[PDB]
């Protein structure tokens, strides 16, 4: 049996700037049980039709997870630009996989403001496909040296989403699992 049940129900989920990935092999996939669940609100499949998934079997599969806002769910797709798909996580233009996204206004809806999930704001160049950078050195905005001191023209290169219990539908948190098939 596959470990799918573990990634879809784990008690902890990483933020988007340090997204974890898992590799799964030697299991019997059961896309069926997830082919009818109504919990998922955005079950998009790119490259391969979702119905024929069960018949064919592959060698190696990868699963990645993020917690993202309501608006940026559409940005997890090939050939898209924005504040998230270009500096934090980008997909190859020849993507062949699935992007499951569901609502998490119960587990992750902190009371009084969470301020624990952060996304990357400032950088210097775009991101190659499947590129992760956990480093958090101080970013500079001018020729003046910054020597690791926060201040004018010296900004921390992260921002904290503000998830709350009464936010609108467009800003409520969503959890995304992207499956990539080699």
């Amino acid at each position, epitope marked *: 049996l596959c470990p799918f049940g573990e990634v879809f129900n784990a008690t902890r989920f990483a933020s988007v700037y340090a997204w974890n990935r898992k590799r799964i092999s030697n299991c019997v996939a059961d896309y069926s049980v997830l082919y009818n669940s109504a919990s998922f609100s955005t079950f998009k499949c790119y490259g391969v039709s979702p119905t024929k998934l069960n018949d064919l079997c592959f060698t190696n599969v990868y699963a990645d997870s993020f917690v993202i806002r309501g608006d940026e769910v559409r940005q997890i797709a090939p050939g898209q630009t924005g504040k998230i798909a270009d500096y934090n996580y980008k997909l190859p233009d020849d993507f062949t996989g699935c992007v499951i996204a569901w609502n998490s206004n119960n587990l992750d809806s902190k009371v009084g403001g969470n301020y624990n999930y952060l996304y990357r704001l*400032f950088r*210097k160049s*775009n991101l190659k496909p499947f590129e992760r950078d956990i480093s958090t050195e101080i970013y*500079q*905005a001018g020729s003046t040296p910054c020597n690791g001191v926060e201040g004018f023209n010296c*900004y921390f290169p992260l921002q904290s989403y503000g998830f709350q219990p009464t*936010n*609108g539908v467009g800003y409520q948190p969503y959890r995304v699992v992207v499956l990539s098939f080699e």
Partner: antibody
Amino acid sequence: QLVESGGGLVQPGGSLRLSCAASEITVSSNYMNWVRQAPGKGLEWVSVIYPGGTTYYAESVKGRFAISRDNSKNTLYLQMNSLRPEDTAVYYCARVMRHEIWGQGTLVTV
Amino acid sequence: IQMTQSQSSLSASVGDRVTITCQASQDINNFLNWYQQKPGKAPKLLIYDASHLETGVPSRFSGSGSGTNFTFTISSLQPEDIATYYCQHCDNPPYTFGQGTKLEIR
């Protein structure tokens, strides 16, 4: 600080290259905004360029102007192509998303 | 998203408290900026994210509101504060400005 230049009159259908010169600020590392204003009317958005090179234009003026950056002189350039009579307005060059500083301003008329 | 200012001109005396309302269609959670523009000058940012105050402006200026309606409050009016104020949506492109409100002293 910033500075604009190239303001004046141009015959309908022409083109121009407005220059925004920046000092103390590296143009290759911040979000940049280009905002226009009609004479006596309210502000309207025109263009934005991201640090990574992505660029967004306004919905009503899409496909006629082009913004670019030059690191050798540290400048921002905007090239308008295929103008019209109502295109006349005062444009500006500003920094966004941390510590907004708005430059003095140029005038472009038909 | 169509930001709107129902009012267009409010007058008061020196030392009075003045409020300005800016409404937004659909919903913007906490994304709005208050811009001030003096006659014949370049506009300067006053309040970002509708609750945090910028450095340099006196503390007597304040902002509040959320969801659909936002408000800008001046506690003590000053003789040299005649200007035009705008509210701008600044979450994700495009960024649509408002109509503007002109303050008059008497």
